[PDB]
């Protein structure tokens, strides 16, 4: 359980969607982060993979604001303290807004995977995962925006999948957090995109899995990494 509290881009903080404050406020502030109804700080499990909730989390609506990023620039997402127990991958996708991200229909967004990190080491099952990397970096993740993509407005869908309960059907816990970016530079790729509702299925090999046993491999869920 947790959420993204802050985003660091080009030397300033863009405050996150503080899901334990703003839902209680009813004139809440404008941010680059999508609003959600996930006030339990919880997840979308396999029962929700083909619902709109998977796209940018439960009840999500676009952020009003969009943050410019320098070409090949970093976006650092700062989480609330991630529990060691919640082992699993950290996955990052972009979808083009083809206009202002604040007015997009999230159900039409087509995501391409720009980064994925999975099982890092399995010397002591359940092992060391991308989520443990995030903990070791004091609960932050650095995303580098590719220089080879067509610049424009994009949703960054940033996600931890916790697998501590994933040996049961619909046990995997997805924690998607969306923010609005203005990608800048000279690139031209328009990578093939996947609907939010086709990212994951509740029987995928990296989703329905027992992490407590020795693992010979881990198949990071979602569509193929764009390079
Ligand atoms: C996180 O930062 C705090 C100090 O602000 C420190 O006490 C903790 O050990 C840090 N680093 C790691 C690897 O957790
Ligand atoms: Cu949790």
Swiss-Prot record:
<keyword id="KW-0964">Secreted</keyword>
<dbReference type="GO" id="GO:0005576">
    <property type="term" value="C:extracellular region"/>
</dbReference>
<dbReference type="GO" id="GO:0030245">
    <property type="term" value="P:cellulose catabolic process"/>
</dbReference>
<keyword id="KW-0136">Cellulose degradation</keyword>
<feature type="disulfide bond">
    <location>
        <begin position="97"/>
        <end position="101"/>
    </location>
</feature>
<feature type="binding site">
    <location>
        <position position="175"/>
    </location>
    <ligand>
        <name>Cu(2+)</name>
    </ligand>
</feature>
<feature type="binding site">
    <location>
        <position position="86"/>
    </location>
    <ligand>
        <name>Cu(2+)</name>
    </ligand>
</feature>
<keyword id="KW-0503">Monooxygenase</keyword>
<dbReference type="InterPro" id="IPR049892">
    <property type="entry name" value="AA9"/>
</dbReference>
<feature type="disulfide bond">
    <location>
        <begin position="56"/>
        <end position="178"/>
    </location>
</feature>
<keyword id="KW-0186">Copper</keyword>
<feature type="binding site">
    <location>
        <position position="164"/>
    </location>
    <ligand>
        <name>O2</name>
    </ligand>
</feature>
<keyword id="KW-1015">Disulfide bond</keyword>
<keyword id="KW-0624">Polysaccharide degradation</keyword>
<dbReference type="GO" id="GO:0004497">
    <property type="term" value="F:monooxygenase activity"/>
</dbReference>
<protein>
    <recommendedName>
        <fullName>AA9 family lytic polysaccharide monooxygenase A</fullName>
        <ecNumber>1.14.99.56</ecNumber>
    </recommendedName>
</protein>
<feature type="binding site">
    <location>
        <position position="1"/>
    </location>
    <ligand>
        <name>Cu(2+)</name>
    </ligand>
</feature>
<dbReference type="GO" id="GO:0008810">
    <property type="term" value="F:cellulase activity"/>
</dbReference>
<feature type="modified residue" description="Methylhistidine">
    <location>
        <position position="1"/>
    </location>
</feature>
<keyword id="KW-0325">Glycoprotein</keyword>
<comment type="function">
    <text>Lytic polysaccharide monooxygenase (LPMO) that depolymerizes crystalline and amorphous polysaccharides via the oxidation of scissile alpha- or beta-(1-4)-glycosidic bonds, yielding C1 and C4 oxidation product. Catalysis by LPMOs requires the reduction of the active-site copper from Cu(II) to Cu(I) by a reducing agent and H(2)O(2) or O(2) as a cosubstrate. Is able to cleave cellulose and xylan to produce C1- and C4-oxidized products.</text>
</comment>
<keyword id="KW-0479">Metal-binding</keyword>
<keyword id="KW-0488">Methylation</keyword>
<comment type="similarity">
    <text>Belongs to the polysaccharide monooxygenase AA9 family.</text>
</comment>
<dbReference type="InterPro" id="IPR005103">
    <property type="entry name" value="AA9_LPMO"/>
</dbReference>
<keyword id="KW-0560">Oxidoreductase</keyword>
<dbReference type="Pfam" id="PF03443">
    <property type="entry name" value="AA9"/>
</dbReference>
<feature type="glycosylation site" description="N-linked (GlcNAc...) asparagine">
    <location>
        <position position="138"/>
    </location>
</feature>
<feature type="binding site">
    <location>
        <position position="173"/>
    </location>
    <ligand>
        <name>O2</name>
    </ligand>
</feature>
<keyword id="KW-0119">Carbohydrate metabolism</keyword>
<dbReference type="GO" id="GO:0046872">
    <property type="term" value="F:metal ion binding"/>
</dbReference>
